[PDB]
Design a protein around this ligand. Structure first.
Ligand code: HEM
Ligand code: HEM
Ligand code: HEM
Ligand code: HEM
Lengths: 141, 145, 141, 145
């Protein structure tokens, strides 16, 4: 559960991400693939080389989605339903991988927002990625 | 990675295992308990229900190969990596199987074992078997890149 | 999320455990301590040797807890609230440990219910245990 | 442990690090990002708020001893087990710490390295580092029984 504070911290930091988000998505991706090489098992149809149109377009769809979750942190389930359906019924990405991406997402954030990334925002984004992960995985079985 | 007593405990119990029967149960159970693993077997046919799954011919067939291969490693419990090197590589390079699955399998397996052996699959034998599966999962993931 | 089938399965199987639960509790622990010795990190005060009443006793507690859950399957959070507090604010048992004990539980169910442990009920039980786990670590942060 | 190219990155960055500074931050965020990890520090006094924690002097002392130990570690990337043996044992028999806490830290640490180094923390250095946090965690769990 994201308390009000958490919600505050997320929208705040997400905001600062602003129009960088997409390229944020694309670096988090590249960071997962290089750090957690097993995650590439879900992307054999992708040119996974640095600066791929694919990864960038993908990092972009990812971010959009997060911007949506943030825009709707009080109704993540319906906000993300379409995507929880596709994740459970089409991509079927094992749930351990959500956590790996949450991680590289934190890393991306930390490194792009030297001011906003305090212990309490860190905490909050963590709880929040953990929450997104859950919505998306909720319909797995 | 197993002590003298755990090796004895694993071997003994594997003696009583019809690899084919266990193989189909485990593979079938994976698919029922963690439906997302169905992602690698879209050819296998109907996986719509526990039933369809469980009785599907390809599940059983496939399950047999797997555990046949699992059985081969039991033999080389001291070269667990060396042994699965070719398989590690194929699951990566061609199958694109997230190594996580090997872990779901080992657990489902332990479950199958226990179900089948009841009171014989004791805390200590399970312990020995938790090590083996883990060892197997790691051996198969070893060439992932 | 626990479907109607899932609840039936759960209630059915839990039904059979009947007054065995406490015994199945202790065994489950024992399975855990030997299978996943990291879990012993939480019981330095316990005599962990085979037969230990301590294990038996904690075993009993767990099973009754699990019994309450089943009884209140549609109202777990409030059913378990006192126990989500205790884990979160006092025991503070890493969340990953709840999956080890879950598996151990399943394992023990397996070995004592050859008729009832069908692939379908196996499924329901994992589900249900995951739900209990979620509810017990719901207030960790 | 890693490719030479990888150690070099690793030792390169850490060159520019304030073990005491990072120590305390890492330990602190661990205690904030994962409150359950606090269980071991109830003699550390006040931990009631993120500010208390980050400010607590003991957490600060703790943070620097853990992390200097980590530092000695980096010099032995070819023997983390050799290095962490006794320290694994104590964590095990005396401290009773769940090795997961070691992974949580490791994760917190990379976060800390990224905030602290911005863009010099490229995906590759990240990776290199991920191997090292994985490695050290692996090495402290290692004597657990
Ligand atoms: C932060 C959690 C995640 C979010 C919000 C997210 C979101 C998305 C979205 C919005 C799409 C595209 C949907 C469409 O095209 O309509 C997508 C596709 C995809 N995602 Fe997820 N995802 C997440 C986690 C993951 C993880 C962890 C993996 C793999 C390890 C993964 C694998 C995939 C793949 C394989 C595709 C489709 C490939 C393609 O379209 O060509 N996702 N995801
Ligand atoms: C101990 C664990 C495992 C072992 C030893 C193993 C072994 C094997 C072997 C030997 C083959 C090739 C059959 C032959 O020799 O022709 C195979 C193929 C395959 N395995 Fe694995 N496997 C394991 C676990 C898994 C898991 C957990 C999954 C996915 C959930 C999986 C997915 C596949 C697939 C999709 C194929 C190709 C089958 C086909 O052609 O349709 N395996 N495996
Ligand atoms: C669904 C799984 C679990 C349930 C239902 C459960 C429930 C309980 C209950 C009912 C008690 C006693 C409550 C009281 O005294 O008021 C308890 C205590 C405790 N549990 Fe949990 N628990 C679970 C998982 C775990 C796990 C996974 C661990 C560690 C691996 C753990 C460690 C402990 C400890 C250390 C105590 C305190 C006992 C003592 O030292 O006196 N629990 N738990
Ligand atoms: C990179 C990871 C770590 C390293 C290298 C490490 C190293 C050390 C060292 C060198 C000591 C010696 C202290 C003594 O003799 O009292 C110590 C103690 C301790 N560690 Fe770890 N540790 C690590 C991670 C952790 C984590 C993640 C936690 C917990 C949540 C933890 C909890 C403790 C505690 C409670 C003590 C005892 C301190 C005292 O007695 O004053 N450690 N650690």
């Amino acid at each position: 559960v994201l308390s009000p504070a958490d919600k505050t911290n997320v929208k705040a930091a997400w905001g600062k991400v602003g129009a960088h988000a997409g390229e944020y998505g694309a670096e988090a991706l590249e960071r997962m693939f290089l750090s957690f090489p097993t995650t590439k098992t879900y992307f054999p149809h992708f040119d996974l080389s640095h600066g791929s149109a694919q990864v960038k377009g993908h990092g972009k769809k990812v971010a959009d989605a997060l911007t949506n979750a943030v825009a709707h942190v009080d109704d993540m389930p319906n906000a993300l339903s379409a995507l929880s359906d596709l994740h459970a019924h089409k991509l079927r990405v094992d749930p351990v991988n959500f956590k790996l991406l949450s991680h590289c997402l934190l890393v991306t954030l930390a490194a792009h927002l030297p001011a906003e990334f305090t212990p309490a925002v860190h905490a909050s984004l963590d709880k929040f990625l953990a929450s997104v992960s859950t919505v998306l995985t909720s319909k797995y079985r | 990675m197993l002590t003298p007593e755990e090796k004895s405990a694993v071997t003994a119990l594997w003696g009583k295992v019809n690899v084919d029967e266990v193989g189909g149960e485990a593979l079938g159970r994976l698919l029922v308990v963690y439906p997302w693993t169905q992602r690698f077997f879209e050819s296998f046919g109907d996986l719509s229900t526990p039933d369809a799954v469980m009785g599907n011919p390809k599940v059983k067939a496939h399950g047999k190969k797997v555990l046949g291969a699992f059985s081969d490693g039991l033999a080389h419990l001291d070269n667990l990596k060396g042994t699965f090197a070719t398989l590690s590589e194929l699951h990566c390079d061609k199958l694109h199987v997230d190594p996580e699955n090997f872990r779901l399998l080992g657990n489902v397996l332990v479950c199958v074992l226990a179900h089948h052996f009841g009171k014989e699959f004791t805390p200590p034998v399970q312990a020995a078997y938790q090590k083996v599966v883990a060892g197997v999962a790691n051996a198969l993931a070893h060439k992932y890149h």
